Subunit: 399 residues, 3 copies
Amino acid sequence: YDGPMPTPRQKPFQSGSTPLHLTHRFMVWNSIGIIRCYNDEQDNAIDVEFHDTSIHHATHLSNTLNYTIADLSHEAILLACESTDELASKLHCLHFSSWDSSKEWIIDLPQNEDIEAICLGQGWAAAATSALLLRLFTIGGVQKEVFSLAGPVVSMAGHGEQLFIVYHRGTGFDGDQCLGVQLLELGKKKKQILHGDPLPLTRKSYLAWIGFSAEGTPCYVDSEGIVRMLNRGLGNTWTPICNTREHCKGKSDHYWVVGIHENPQQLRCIPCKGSRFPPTLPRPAVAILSFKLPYCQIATEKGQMEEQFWRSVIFHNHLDYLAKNGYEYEESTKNQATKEQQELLMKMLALSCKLEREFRCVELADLMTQNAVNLAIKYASRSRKLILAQKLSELAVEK
Amino acid sequence: YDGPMPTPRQKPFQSGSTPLHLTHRFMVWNSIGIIRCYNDEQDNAIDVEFHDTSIHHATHLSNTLNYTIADLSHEAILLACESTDELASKLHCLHFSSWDSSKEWIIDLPQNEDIEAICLGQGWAAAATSALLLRLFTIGGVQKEVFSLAGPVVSMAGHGEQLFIVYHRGTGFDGDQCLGVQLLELGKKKKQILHGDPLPLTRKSYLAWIGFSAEGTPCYVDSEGIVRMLNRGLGNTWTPICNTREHCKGKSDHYWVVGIHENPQQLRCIPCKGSRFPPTLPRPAVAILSFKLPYCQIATEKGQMEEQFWRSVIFHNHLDYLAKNGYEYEESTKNQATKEQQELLMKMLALSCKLEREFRCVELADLMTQNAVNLAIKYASRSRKLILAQKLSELAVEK
Amino acid sequence: YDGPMPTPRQKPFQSGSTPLHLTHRFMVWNSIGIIRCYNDEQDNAIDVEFHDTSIHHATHLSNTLNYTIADLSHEAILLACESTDELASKLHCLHFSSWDSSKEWIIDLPQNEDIEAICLGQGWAAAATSALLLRLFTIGGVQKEVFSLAGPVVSMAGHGEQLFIVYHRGTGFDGDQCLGVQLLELGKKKKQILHGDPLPLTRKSYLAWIGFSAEGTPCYVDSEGIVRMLNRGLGNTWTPICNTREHCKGKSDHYWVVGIHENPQQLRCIPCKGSRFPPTLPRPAVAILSFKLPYCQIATEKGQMEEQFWRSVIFHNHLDYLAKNGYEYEESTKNQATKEQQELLMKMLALSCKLEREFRCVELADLMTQNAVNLAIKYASRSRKLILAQKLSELAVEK
């Protein structure tokens, strides 16, 4: 046969974990902690570590039921295993944060159904299954809801009241994966944000990591090391914010994501030399990288100011989202970010004056606050750019 | 060729009908009536029968034009045929409910355009054609507005102002059909609810039945006998509400669905043994099945109360939808359903309290009305679980 | 290989261009002007022509940087070329309307990223790239926000604050192209109208032309000459408005679109015989075709009035859209269209009345203004159609 080929589908995987064939492997490594599974033929056991054990004390448990999937939160540790010829698939919750005494519970699936991915959010847990069903639970194990997925699930993540799902949307071809995304908000009023929409990916690539920023923005990375974030402001589009391949010292090196922060701007990941993932031991060192958006002509300070400006704007979108959600936020941050953005716009405007691109100055001033346009009028007047000062005055009258 | 294989596409079909090659077949069986096709040496004719004899008298029509597709509503009978080498594809409406006297009309389609599916709604009719176009009509045959479909249509259903369409969304593989759903509201304001979104299916299944509950909720069933209903309370997701294979006492059993009622909770279907559908004769008898959400650990009273509670919740979504559309209902139904839901929550809360899962009690109380939380506070106080009574009081203060 | 075949994907193209290997060819021809590329081994140059040179003077440019894709607006000429072993892909804007000191700017893309499609809108420009990225620019060459494309782009168009993208949504089969569309608004509030939703197409067709009505409604045409327009009044569905094959007097004829107008109702296109597109020499001439919605029984006066009525309705939907977007509009034209529609409804009602389909008269009266209903009541009274007059009176009372 001479034609193009259907791509072999990516299997489901729990985000931030390493392959099952390893005796000692990571089940989940995130901003909360690290879960290591030690599955020797001698011993099948689990090691739970918090980056702060005041959350809950360092804990080790025998993996008697042979859990293979796990998740970690501020509230609870969630564990899951497949069905066997003897067992239903089981979901085991260790709710350490409870104020009631009985801090564990287990749920057994309907008989032929298997868990394939899980995730945790504020006071709730979710599990996706081989029935192409998604099951919702409270953190205390009340069954909340059940519904059908659009296709074979790939991975899941949870943050606050947000549930982020990725699944197979069709047949991919010639190395591409046909993947779709569902994003839901589970508030007093409940919304589906993304209705199985197509998920942007690099050519001949597969999904490598998903999750949220600590600020609660959906994010993901592909096998080409391209980090993409949900741009809520820009019509819920997907903006690339970093290309990790730039820093691979040898090209067979890779970066394995651990967490994301918008403020401080931090990408937390582990450098893996000659491997797409880290070994469990000797304990890898997490590396922290800054984001850098793929702006053109970035060798110019003009491009750098544009990149810095939009990077700043994007990373502050979570404050508006939180405000719209009625979640509390530090408005001083928004004032400061606005000021930084006005300073960047003013620097770009001043440079544009010196470049004689006064039309471009008005374009930059269109993005300014009214106070910054007043300052721009004063600067332009002092610079004897009176045509620009007039144009800016008309803009100020329009604002 | 060594690759996986594209699934052969499901051919379009009228819901609640039986296959064309049968000389005697059901053109449509719904909650209104039955339409039989007789292509016999005695007579090539179509026979219409109403379940409630008071609606209209039984009617017989000679099928000279060789109609092949049909539909039935409270208002009219709709018939359609393909083009021949000489005939247009024709749409024939017999609008018996009219107050005017000239109670029929026929419309001829353009050349090379064939009707592929039809359906009836309140005062309007819709027809999808091999031009990949959808045509709309008033019940009296004014042409309403035409638009284009995303792919080859599979089936359609109408209820009130709602139009529910399913079509081929792409190429499915290895036995999966690739189906998409489009849902429109044809009120004074016209809206599109589902934008060609993917339709959930059981693996390697195909669509078997499509329609609405009598209460006007979109619903469908696949070839694996899984009934799915639109979950308006959950961001317009698809929730399974029954698995007929539990009552497939033999694997050759099948349940040929005829209609759905949320109040009383009834699935109306015909049991078929050795065939996916019944023969025309001897006249089959309607069987009633109950709904059952596929909740986990359902042998437990805890799981049973959860399943009952959420099943009750889902079936009451139609009252909210009716209210959003300005349509009315007996509010005592809503009060009673709410009360039953409170009683189920109260029983689950009492069980959780006696299990000393007091955290789970507060999680259940989160779903209670304020009066039910007050009653839960009184129960907890009378049970002398004062920590729980305190937590419930905090919740009551919060609401 | 025994199974059905995945279709090869349609290559990207600029709308209103002609194929690249033609030494003398059209780069873009729209309602603003004509741009021609003349690529001799001795001379590679581009000719710019305006349909009104007061906008700017017709201009000849030496194509030393070897641009291959281009666009034209009221404000600027946009040019683009691919990278080489020595060059980035470059975007060159000739901003002829600028009042600042230079009417040009150039942007060089990141390494190994190539421009694949471009378009212009009101004060902004957009470029889609081989990185599956969408890059936005102001008309003066600020860099605006960047995001990821759903798949390989096919073509783009812009009008006002609207940006219209089409891309490969999946793998088509047996001659079909699987295409998806994204439609975004770039106002002070930014929105996504179509979430990468499927694009309707004629069977086995491919996309031939894309753009907007001069009135600002998205429209497109496939390789079968079927013109479709976005129906904002019908939940943003796609309505066909013309089959150009009816005017293929020879059926090797084709119509190559240049522009679209709702008011006056005009399809502006070039007739091409034995080719889907015109050569640059001898200088072609535009033909104007009228729209013709594919309504049934169009040989009848009834069908003609229905076609005219809906055609009139559709071509004035933009007035409401523009008003909601704060654009100014011809209220007089809205009154004119209202009058056309009342006259057509009155004629259809009178015809139905004389055909004694009195129920259909009431159906038509539902679409009338209250004044037209009162006039219809008086007509019915004078006709002594008192039952119909009563039904119409009850409808008038209902409004």
